[PDB]
Amino acid sequence: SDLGKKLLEAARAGQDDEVRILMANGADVNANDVHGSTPLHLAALIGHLEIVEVLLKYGADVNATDIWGNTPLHLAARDGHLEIVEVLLKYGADVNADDTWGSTPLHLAAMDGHLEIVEVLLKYGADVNAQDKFGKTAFDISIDNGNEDLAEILQ
Amino acid sequence: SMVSKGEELFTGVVPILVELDGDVNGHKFSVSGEGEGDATYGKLTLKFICTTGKLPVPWPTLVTTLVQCFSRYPDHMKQHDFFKSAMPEGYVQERTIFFKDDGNYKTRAEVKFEGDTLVNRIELKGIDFKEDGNILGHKLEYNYNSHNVYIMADKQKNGIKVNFKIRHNIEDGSVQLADHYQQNTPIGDGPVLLPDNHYLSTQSALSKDPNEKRDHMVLLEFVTAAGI
Numbered sequence: 355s356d357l358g359k360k361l362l363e364a365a366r367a368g369q370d371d372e373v374r375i376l377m378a379n380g381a382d383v384n385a386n387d388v389h390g391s392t393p394l395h396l397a398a399l400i401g402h403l404e405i406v407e408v409l410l411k412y413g414a415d416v417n418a419t420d421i422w423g424n425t426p427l428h429l430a431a432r433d434g435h436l437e438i439v440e441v442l443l444k445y446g447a448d449v450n451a452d453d454t455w456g457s458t459p460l461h462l463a464a465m466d467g468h469l470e471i472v473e474v475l476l477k478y479g480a481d482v483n484a485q486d487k488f489g490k491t492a493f494d495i496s497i498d499n500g501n502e503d504l505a506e507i508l509q
Numbered sequence: 510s511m512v513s514k515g516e517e518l519f520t521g522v523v524p525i526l527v528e529l530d531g532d533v534n535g536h537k538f539s540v541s542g543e544g545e546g547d548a549t550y551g552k553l554t555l556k557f558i559c560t561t562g563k564l565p566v567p568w569p570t571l572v573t574t575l576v577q578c579f580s581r582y583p584d585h586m587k588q589h590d591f592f593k594s595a596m597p598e599g600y601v602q603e604r605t606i607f608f609k610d611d612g613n614y615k616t617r618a619e620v621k622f623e624g625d626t627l628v629n630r631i632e633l634k635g636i637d638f639k640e641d642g643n644i645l646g647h648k649l650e651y652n653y654n655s656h657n658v659y660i661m662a663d664k665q666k667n668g669i670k671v672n673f674k675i676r677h678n679i680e681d682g683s684v685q686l687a688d689h690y691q692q693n694t695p696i697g698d699g700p701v702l703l704p705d706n707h708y709l710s711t712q713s714a715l716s717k718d719p720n721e722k723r724d725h726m727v728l729l730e731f732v733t734a735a736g737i
């Protein structure tokens with residue numbers, strides 16, 4: 355919207371107090387920009403856990419997708435934000451959501467070398483046999499990157 | 510892990526300005542663009558307008574010409590982000606683009622900060638375009654493919670180079686290749702880290718604004734680095 359634009363900006367800027375103010379004054383929790391990015395995408399992106407929680411409490415869609423196929427879990431997994439991965443999963447994030455290239459959060463987390471995030475994704479039923487559109491599983495990726503520790507838990 | 514002086518400037522959302530002065534087979538035109546980029550997300554949001562009237566070439570032919578400093582780089586690769594690390598004083602970007610069975614563009618651009626805004630100023634020259642053909646004849650579809658590009662250090666020239674092919678879709682199912690030869694050099698004169706070779710992956714969506722009378726293009730992009 356308008357109140358929605360303010361909210362997208364405050365979320366991305368990591369201004370927690372502004373977000374709370376906007377939310378209690380009735381801002382649209384599921385506002386999005388032209389890319390389909392929601393405030394929850396943005397707070398997960400920058401790793402602001404308290405904001406992620408506030409937004410979930412006020413009815414944020416945990417599975418909102420941008421036009422590139424990114425959910426907030428994709429962005430949190432890619433950027434290495436473990437507690438945010440945990441909370442998104444607990445409150446219903448689709449662990450096997452595919453972006454445009456067929457990448458699941460497990461692929462993104464494996465590509466960036468984020469071991470603890472991979473362990474949590476697996477705990478929540480991440481598919482080790484899912485292929486992206488270059489035909490690569492997360493396991494194949496970890497081998498390409500020479501990462502013993504990921505290869506061992508992804509086999 | 511590393512955060513260079515120039516990387517510090519891209520932690521937030523950054524306003525963008527693009528100015529292009531063009532000449533193709535003698536047809537003069539100008540394009541201006543505005544919007545913003547978010548290098549942490551890896552996204553661009555831009556709107557471009559032809560200020561001279563009607564664009565004498567297809568908009569898709571201009572996309573590569575109209576700021577790779579907005580690519581998202583993983584933490585382990587931040588020391589390889591030449592583009593952001595050249596800021597604020599910026600870099601020169603030079604291309605020759607050969608359209609197969611048709612003419613070519615030559616571009617020179619300066620990308621740098623002017624105040625708080627990242628500004629791409631371009632000169633473009635096109636020649637030897639068939640009046641019949643896909644470009645001047647405007648037979649390109651209004652869309653854009655996803656492309657990976659391989660970024661290479663060039664020690665001898667103290668910069669980087671990129672040689673890539675763009676596939677433009679034509680009305681009747683066929684495809685028009687555009688071979689890009691790119692060279693980038695810092696404007697600063699100090700010592701500079703040249704990157705290890707790696708890739709940029711670009712996705713692009715072209716659209717129109719419902720309320721814009723002028724010849725324009727809305728361009729959204731999503732860009733990530735990989736391969737180290």
Ligand SMILES: [Br-]
Pocket residue numbers: 366367520521522
């Ligand atoms: Br910001």
